[PDB]
């Protein structure tokens with residue numbers, strides 16, 4: 001089997017991408033944030049505290065004839081922004097572009113934190129990291145990809161995120177028309193539960209490529225590109241007036257600037273992020289100070305190749321017995 005679905009930016013800055021997902025019988029369609037940095041499929045629901053729902057579409061398990069409460073199961077997650085959610089668990093039928101998994105754990109939110117409530121465009125997350133990170137207790141549950149993978153023509157999914165435009169998630173096949181040149185595959189460590197790999201270096205604009213190992217994760221659920229402070233300083237040094245602001249919480253730059261590209265290495269291959277991808281607009285409405293799309297990972301503990309990086313590439317998440325990651329230019 002295979003599946004394909006279009007993924008769409010939630011706003012004009014590409015802060016995140018949402019992909020429609022069918023849950024239950026009859027189908028309830030929710031727009032989920034496909035997240036290769038986490039492993040829970042969780043949704044706003046009829047059980048979510050009413051005050052914490054503000055425009056999201058909810059899953060109502062009582063209206064699904066295939067929903068079954070998973071007895072005694074709960075879940076609870078927190079993310080790096082201090083945001084969180086928790087609730088109970090149903091199994092139900094879940095489909096992405098007709099690719100169907102029966103018995104998928106659907107984690108129904110009883111509580112969500114303010115950042116989720118305040119974002120009306122995201123009805124939940126669909127995790128695509130490794131199932132070792134799934135938070136369901138006392139019995140850990142499998143991701144949608146793990147449940148689907150044996151049925152797929154090939155045990156893979158691909159992310160083709162657009163810059164200020166829709167893109168595509170494919171499951172089970174490689175669309176060889178979606179990229180240029182060849183796909184360069186690179187080794188993955190699953191020890192922390194992520195699609196963790198090692199970039200071979202970087203360049204800023206037309207500058208000299210620096211060969212240096214940069215360990216990080218391919219994370220579709222993170223907006224920006226988080227890299228070591230030395231690398232990030234090298235980038236922003238090329239933008240007149242750019243500086244790290246403690247109060248804002250990262251590098252800001254004059255909105256009138258033209259941003260240079262940023263290149264990262266995948267083996268001997270090179271992925272070029274155009275400068276415009278690195279502009280996240282005014283820090284507050286009407287400001288002429290703009291927020292940078294490349295930021296320091298110093299306080300994170302891990303580098304994150306988030307959407308800023310991934311959207312410059314066609315990315316293969318290869319879930320063979322020994323997983324690997326593939327990157328191609330596009």
Ligand SMILES: O=C(CNCc1ccccc1)Nc1scc(-c2ccccc2)c1C(=O)NCc1ccccc1
Pocket residue numbers: 033035036037038079080081083125219221222223299300302304
């Ligand atoms: O958690 C993820 C992937 N899920 C991102 C997500 C999606 C929707 C809503 C909320 C979050 N990736 C990882 S791995 C490690 C971190 C991290 C980040 C900051 C501090 C400590 C750990 C993050 C993460 O939270 N990414 C999103 C993010 C939020 C705020 C600031 C930077 C990055």
